[PDB]
Symmetry: D3
Subunit: 338 residues, 6 copies
Amino acid sequence: SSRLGYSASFEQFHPSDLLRWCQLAEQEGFDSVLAADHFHPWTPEQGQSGFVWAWLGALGATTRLRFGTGVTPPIGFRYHPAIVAQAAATLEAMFPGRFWLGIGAGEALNEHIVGRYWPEPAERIRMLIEAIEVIQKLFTGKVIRHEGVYFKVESAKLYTMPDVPPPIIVGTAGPYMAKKTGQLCDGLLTPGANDEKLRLLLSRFEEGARAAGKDPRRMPRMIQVHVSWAETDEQAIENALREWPNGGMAFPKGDIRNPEDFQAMARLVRPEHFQGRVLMTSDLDRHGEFLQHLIDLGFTEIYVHNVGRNQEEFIRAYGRAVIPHLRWPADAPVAQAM
Amino acid sequence: SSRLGYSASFEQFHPSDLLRWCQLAEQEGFDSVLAADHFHPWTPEQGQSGFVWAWLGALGATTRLRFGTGVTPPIGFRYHPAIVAQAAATLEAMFPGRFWLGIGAGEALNEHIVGRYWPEPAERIRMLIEAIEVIQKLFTGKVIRHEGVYFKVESAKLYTMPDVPPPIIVGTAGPYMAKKTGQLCDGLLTPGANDEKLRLLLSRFEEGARAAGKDPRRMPRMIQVHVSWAETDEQAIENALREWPNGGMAFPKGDIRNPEDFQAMARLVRPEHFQGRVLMTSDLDRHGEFLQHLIDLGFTEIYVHNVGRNQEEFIRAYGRAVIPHLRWPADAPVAQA
Amino acid sequence: SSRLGYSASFEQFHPSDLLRWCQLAEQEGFDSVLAADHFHPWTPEQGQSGFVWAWLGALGATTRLRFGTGVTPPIGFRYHPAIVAQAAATLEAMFPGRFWLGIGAGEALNEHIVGRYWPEPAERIRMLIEAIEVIQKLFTGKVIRHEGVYFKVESAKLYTMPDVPPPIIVGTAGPYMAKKTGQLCDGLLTPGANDEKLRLLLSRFEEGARAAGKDPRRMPRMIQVHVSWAETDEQAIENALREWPNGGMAFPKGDIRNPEDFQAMARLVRPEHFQGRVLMTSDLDRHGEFLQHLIDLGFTEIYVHNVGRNQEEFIRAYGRAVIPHLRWPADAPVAQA
Amino acid sequence: SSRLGYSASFEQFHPSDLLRWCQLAEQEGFDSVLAADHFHPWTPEQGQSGFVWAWLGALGATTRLRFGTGVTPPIGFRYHPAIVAQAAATLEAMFPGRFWLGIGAGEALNEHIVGRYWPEPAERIRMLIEAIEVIQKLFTGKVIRHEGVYFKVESAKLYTMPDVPPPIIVGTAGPYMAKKTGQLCDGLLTPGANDEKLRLLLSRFEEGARAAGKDPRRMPRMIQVHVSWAETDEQAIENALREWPNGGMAFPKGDIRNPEDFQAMARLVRPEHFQGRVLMTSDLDRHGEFLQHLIDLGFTEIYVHNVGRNQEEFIRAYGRAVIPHLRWPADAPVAQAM
Amino acid sequence: SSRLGYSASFEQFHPSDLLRWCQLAEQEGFDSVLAADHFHPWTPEQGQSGFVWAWLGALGATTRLRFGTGVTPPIGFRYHPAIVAQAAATLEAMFPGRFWLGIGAGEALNEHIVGRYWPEPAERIRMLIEAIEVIQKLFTGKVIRHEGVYFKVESAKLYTMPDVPPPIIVGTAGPYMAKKTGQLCDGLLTPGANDEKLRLLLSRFEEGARAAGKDPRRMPRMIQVHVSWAETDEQAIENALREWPNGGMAFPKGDIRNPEDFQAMARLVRPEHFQGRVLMTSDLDRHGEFLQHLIDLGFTEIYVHNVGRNQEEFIRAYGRAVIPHLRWPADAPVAQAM
Amino acid sequence: RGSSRLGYSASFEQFHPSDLLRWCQLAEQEGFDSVLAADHFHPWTPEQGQSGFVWAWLGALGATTRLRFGTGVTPPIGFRYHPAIVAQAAATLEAMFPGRFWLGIGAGEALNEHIVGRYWPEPAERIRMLIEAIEVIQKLFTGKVIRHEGVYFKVESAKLYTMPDVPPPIIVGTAGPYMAKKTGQLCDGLLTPGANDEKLRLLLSRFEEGARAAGKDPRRMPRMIQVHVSWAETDEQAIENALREWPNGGMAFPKGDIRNPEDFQAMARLVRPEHFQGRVLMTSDLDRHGEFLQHLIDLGFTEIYVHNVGRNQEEFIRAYGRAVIPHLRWPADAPVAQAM
Ligand SMILES: O=P(O)(O)OC[C@H]1O[C@@H](O)[C@H](O)[C@@H](O)[C@@H]1O
């Protein structure tokens, strides 16, 4: 009954290291992995961005963990929705019961490389909704055709399909899209934020599901949190500043194109700016209470990203002192196929 | 030192089965895998098309085999060249010395799903050449920008990079592109064909490499062949007809959009149409001689696709009776960093 | 009252020869001509493709035959619908009561030359339906404007107009478009196919007409058939293989771009593949029964394409032994204003 | 040896009437026909615009006259250059030695119907030059490919071909294009204008041919003139005003879209505006002198458009009183295939 | 209470001269200015085309006159509608109660320079209607987004705004657009035309306003007239021919691209062609009666363009002999913010 | 030693155009000789709260003062403004106010250009657009009928009939070394923002090199700098004014991709006084203002445009007029942005 999610930070860590650490996380009581889908890190100092789809095959073949993208933008910049659909179907077919397809509206940091018009957030939401339609049609396993405002799909069929499709999870912090997620998709993924914002997103998601005749109590509500654990408070604070200054950027970041841009913006970030966004302490009891609070709000899964380079030590510390003491409701839905 | 390539047919086989069979192939003396990059099978009866990039991670993590795409079209339909570059760099970074990036001009069967203008072959070659430029720029590990006829890349850098890039291998049967492959890339992959055509492609590749100041003797020349082994000749023939009628289609196939189109065309295919394209026999000595002949022509790697559903039996038969008796030149270059 | 249509194969025959043969066909009891609108032949061995619109003027001025395009794609590749409308209006104005405008969704073989995105069949049907709208608006003889998904027409008027427009005939083998043809157009043209498929197309056409308040009994139902007559059965078979291998290609052909593509595919075609698609016999009684059967199914016009180069001999043989013995219903509607 | 060209005005006359009149013109000593390629007449009162390509087949099959388009715009509005090439090849294949392909930059009056950007004249000239390239490639009878600024041609071949291609004649009044015509094409077609302008165009054409190593003395120099003959001078003048007011519009007309536009502009036209553009007289001796002058300038063919509805009477009058008295140089090149 | 509008002809006059003449016009009893928004003059002989938006700032800062564009095409060739909105808001904010935004469907003469597809009039009307929507949204002073057939506006707000927006006046001679003007906008501007045409436009405008629940009696109905005053009738006639031949072109002019085109067309214009379009006389009593007649038809403002170069003399003559004797209804609505 | 002078920077982001007009008139009385006017559609932040249409305002400035003035800067690269229209506007202003207008142009910011809903290129690509726009403007400035077809712009037969005898100078506003060089090569003068000595020297050097390689004499070409200051009655008020009014001054990072005032507003919450060093001088001490400006002259800038960030514009103008402008020492020969 004990469990917790590990957040695999492709922005920071070589994929070989992430693979080994996920294997260790499994040994230490973590039950699932959230894997970023980036082309670029936020900053050069972070220094990585593996191709997540290849890595997920390695994870799948060497562990029994559940895993998902957190998140892929299937809106036709880096990735056409038909390709995301095929990738998701292949992973679930190879590792049945284990994959969840996390999708979102994307950031310029990754999508700008293809040199196309970058729509405002509200327009990208419309793109995401159409992409969901494409993915769901392909997941039926029939020959489908699609023509909408944003995507054209000629006769296409997924021949390699699991018995049951992986759930589609939307990663968003927008009330509007949270409602739509409940209506159109299988579950919600959101970032750490204050109680008021989390409650609003949960409520919107529930309302959307209910208006579509669905039972939201059986739908995953997932949160991705950023923490900094280290041997001292001082090191935890320093790790957050050095490794994750984007965590202290409480402003919309979806239009910023270059790691060098975030790098220059990072020079403004101070410890104060991380409050409510990154917990920075050596006290593992406080980590436990922070996570428990989120369960109590109604989150059914938590994916934890430790911002420090001390991943192995973090994993062992959480395995020993945090995960065993988390109290999950017994019936709580988890992101996996019916 | 004994070795052979296994061709993993995503058109036909569930990725889980391919994974298990590659693991077995490794045990049985195969040293490398060629993996098709399809969205659709040629026919419904073939019945599969896994996303190769995810599968390759599984292969990498559970074997020590070399492996490559055979081939990916990085020309902006299913895949933007920058993404292919990133995928290749990630695989090589995770499995250093093991990945080779096979690329080609693509087929409508897979690319048509995105609903865009499909250029004639010669134009797609020009697209492929520009894509090679994009991939090579990204492989430098610097922040690069690119603006050409076909692709626009804004400031982009591969942060996750091996110390040394994987080789770029072009899959082609065109004399022109074979020459360009020698000039611009690291090695050649071509399908089975008669001696005259293979010699021409090898010669063009060599000429291209030499004119660019490279030594072609150190560059891989790879061939992908289709065979049908079974317990009897009769079963081998039947397997080819049922599973791989596209093997008997000696005509350009790059414009045909649907599995149902090939399926209807398959009704015309007869055993005669496979001669020189698919060896169909139970006689493993004849398999051995066929493969040895290709080595003798100057191919440094062979990837074998058995068309039958009897993959496990084929792998064990080749491991016992074929692979140990193949004679490779000792210095032969292999597709690796 | 005795009659039959002659199919003028622009893919195979020099326009001067077609002109002379149509003149002969008229003398021999044929009453109408169906003229292909191609840019390319299916194969180099066929070896021709005259511009049909110019030829039709010559036909019109030297015979009293009815004639139509079988068929023109007015969907904006080779031809903008406004130009097809003008051409049709001019022909009917010059030869009143004689022209019928046959249109269809087109094939890549002809349309690919302009280098544009080639939509799937269902999308091309939507283009065809919009083109019909454009043609019909122009046929009103008023100044019209049009803005739809596929076509934009600025203020345009046909000043040169017959008193009554030529009928619009759709050439299709699709149930959906057959229904739409009944709804939106004046008549149906379909290729030879088995009885079940022909009955379905007729039924769909009738349903479409009835739902639009039209009487389908007064609307032409036309079929184009391919035959091979020669002095012996053996020559008839050889003629079909050599001249019309596309007749033995029972698969969708609308995406294939080049004569050389069909030429390579032709190497697979055998006599068996022509059954139900091309009647191959020297026995003129069997030709008669085959055609009579189609009349009995409810076709009101038949256009016969003899695949052999023996056009003159075919015309004389049909004139002597086939046409006089065909029994047409007395009331049967014919494609004319 | 006696001859003259008849100009078939599709803007004014039903194609059936034009066919009969061309047959008569042949009987009366005319040897060739120039056929306008319009979609619209200049004015509603003109009232026609047959599809020339169909009509030319009828002309070809019922006469022995030479004939040409005067002119077709093969620049991708109404007509793609590959289709013009095929049409020209078919006509010449059916009627060898008789067809000449007249081409030009086109007018909005006809091209605007397809609803596309209408370039300035100089840009349309660049389009015409590229179209010439396409037509010439196709006329080789090989499989050709083309990719330029304006046209894309995928693997294309003319299987139906004459032994020798029809000549390409450019219709232009521009000095620059006249030079290019000499360089790239087989002959020049120009409208009636004052002596100075005609001499300049001839000179430019000659220079272009010479710089390309060609002999301009063997290349056709063709002029299309508008006349008004009738039983009295007064009727001839009235006929010009009523039927051909565009003849009195000495200004660029290539951008004007609608017959109704020209119709409204026609209300301003007066007899004076036709001087040098339309000869208006009943005196057939003066018709003779006018035409002879153009021969003397160096034109090797003249195509005469009588603006009046009295086509039959005009044809018979010219046949009796004008054509027999015209003196052509014995060697003069005529627009027809080598 | 006495008043009249002065029409500032940017096609003809250097902006510095227009500025001085407007200052004089104010002294002489004119109360408002209509300023053309051109890039090109109709003819080279006219010889000018200042950027009106810059000039209007000079006018605003050195007079107390009302003023408006007559008219700007906000349909995305020279000008994006968002920019017109901003310009209008700035002028009204700087000169409250004084600016009116006159808009129209534009002419190729000015818009063709940007090298884009030029739609037929009816299509340009649809563009104008969408532009009106954009301008009105921006005039609310909120952050707005817009996506229609012709224009895309991302999050945009006018921070510099008057308390009350300037009125939107449509310049048109089309019955359809006149009705739409009443429905969607604040007032009508039309050119001089015969009584029947003016009555139809007024009636259409009124009907449109009434069907939208508005009171047309409180909405401006403005007319722009062209006159030629000079010391003699003969000079007045000559001035019209030389300076304003476009005034004698009673035909659609919206597709003609170049000053040189109009210049060549001008050679056809004769005095007769100006009847109802340009009053040509030295008799100032007849000027008075002509203007009074238009008031009597129901026009609430008249903008007078003297076609001659004798602007100063015209202004003084009108100030002395015409303006004091015009009788305006006391109630009459004038183009200015509520 | 030249006559006394200084440029006033008119901040359309912050101030109602009517206020700017009155303040420029006062600035003229107080010894300022030229105006730099921002060409924005949006302010950086809602708190700044304005964005008048500069082109209309410039007519009012021209007609009510004798000051020189320029756009600082207009992006003539076809988002808000087609280059042909900028050319016409510039020609009209110079024709109306000969000897007084300078056309300042640049690569633009998303903040203003994004409203038209188009692809926003990276800086280097926008530079290529700017270079083509310069070509278009210069062709139009010849006064002939011109045609243009390039990668970014198509101009059909177009002519400026309303033209000064001599065209206004084209000044490029840039902080990029590459474009600074191009400015020297292709244009008449350079405008750059306040920055450290190293960056300013690089831009000046690039500009000079570009001019020299094109056969021009850079000693006769304007080198202009726009600086942001905060003067107030106390240091404390000067600091507060900078934080409240001009937090973008403390954003030492590329800002050209950020679309919304609300985006900058949220980013502003991170800005602290430290972040303004070298970017905004914050002091009540007018002697220190004097030394700061003099230093820039000494580096080789021939014109300085001063933006006081505070709402105390009138007081700033009077203080500078009394205590700063009279004591600035300009080289006697120094070239100023104006037509030949
Ligand atoms: O809350 P923010 O700053 O928008 O971050 C959203 C998420 O963005 C994703 O790209 C990252 O992988 C996550 O680590 C991060 O939490």
